[PDB]
Write a structure and sequence with these properties.
mainly beta, 13-stranded mixed beta sheet, membrane, 29% strand, 15 strands, Carbonic Anhydrase II, EC 4.2.1.69, globular, monomer, 3 helices, binds the ligand CCN[C@H]1C[C@H](C)S(=O)(=O)c2sc(S(N)(=O)=O)cc21, binds zinc ion, two-stranded parallel sheet
């Protein structure tokens, strides 16, 4: 029932998911001048060379690319984390125009889109168990700005026409998610939540400082997707982002000066 529209969007979510008004909700604005450089923070370790993508899917809220997480193949470690987190899926949030679409903001600046690579802590055995734990997930957030094309995104773009409406999926094997990463792995980090229902407070957020650039043609393809199912009144999948939430009793730490 939940969505991004006037009658089911972020302002309505708390009714079915009261934790929407909790103490560690995401996304947040990253105030670069308030964030503290923490020299104790380790470099991120992104090990994606054995990543095995499975399928790409329109779920009525975003599109996602899913991975085989039945063993340690695509994993995130290091940074603020202890232990190993397996990549399960990635998805995006984007806007109706280039001046909005990101969930996190940087000094109130909104990017055109935001990529989330979702990982779960192997010590909990599966994703369903992990989301019930304060250190269950690590989500790697990457900003998208519009400019030059991102070659590593093109295979994704190429196939969106085949998953236009809710419930559609396609084979999406042999995709290398390394092609979506920026040069630098400098990051901000803070304790937060899923940004969609059920909004569980189970996420260590790792948001990269460096955006990737994607082309206008690439993000236009995102905006042609549909929230609706096939045969239903067409409502473009645009503006599928939750606004910044109160930081409350939290510190955002920077891995860089
Ligand atoms: C459709 C809702 N999906 C939820 C629950 C899934 C179990 S998930 O894969 O853990 C995940 S990751 C994010 S986000 N936007 O914070 O990165 C939202 C969700
Ligand atoms: Zn997300």
């Amino acid at each position: 029932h939940w969505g991004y529209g006037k009658h089911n969007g972020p302002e309505h979510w708390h009714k079915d998911f009261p934790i929407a008004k909790g103490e560690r909700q995401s996304p947040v604005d990253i105030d670069t001048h308030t964030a503290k450089y923490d020299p104790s923070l380790k470099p991120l370790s992104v090990s994606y060379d054995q990543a095995t993508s499975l399928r790409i899917l329109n779920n009525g809220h975003s599109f996602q690319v899913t991975f085989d997480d039945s063993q340690d193949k695509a994993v995130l470690k290091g940074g603020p984390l202890d232990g190993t987190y397996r990549l399960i899926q990635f998805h995006f949030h984007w806007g109706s125009l280039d001046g909005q679409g990101s969930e996190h903001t940087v000094d109130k600046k909104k990017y055109a889109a935001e990529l989330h690579l979702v990982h779960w802590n192997t010590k909990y055995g599966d994703l369903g168990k992990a989301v019930q734990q304060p250190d269950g997930l690590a989500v790697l957030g990457i900003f998208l700005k519009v400019g030059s094309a991102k070659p590593g995104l093109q295979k994704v773009v190429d196939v969106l026409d085949s998953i236009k409406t809710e419930g559609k999926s396609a084979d999406f094997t042999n995709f290398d998610p390394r092609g979506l990463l920026p040069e630098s792995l400098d990051y901000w980090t803070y304790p937060g939540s899923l940004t969609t229902p059920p909004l569980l407070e189970c996420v260590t957020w790792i948001v990269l400082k460096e955006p990737i650039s994607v082309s206008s043609e690439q993000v236009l393809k995102f905006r042609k997707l549909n929230f609706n199912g096939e045969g239903e009144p067409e409502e473009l999948m645009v503006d599928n982002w939750r606004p910044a939430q109160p930081l409350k009793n939290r510190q955002i730490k920077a891995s860089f000066k």
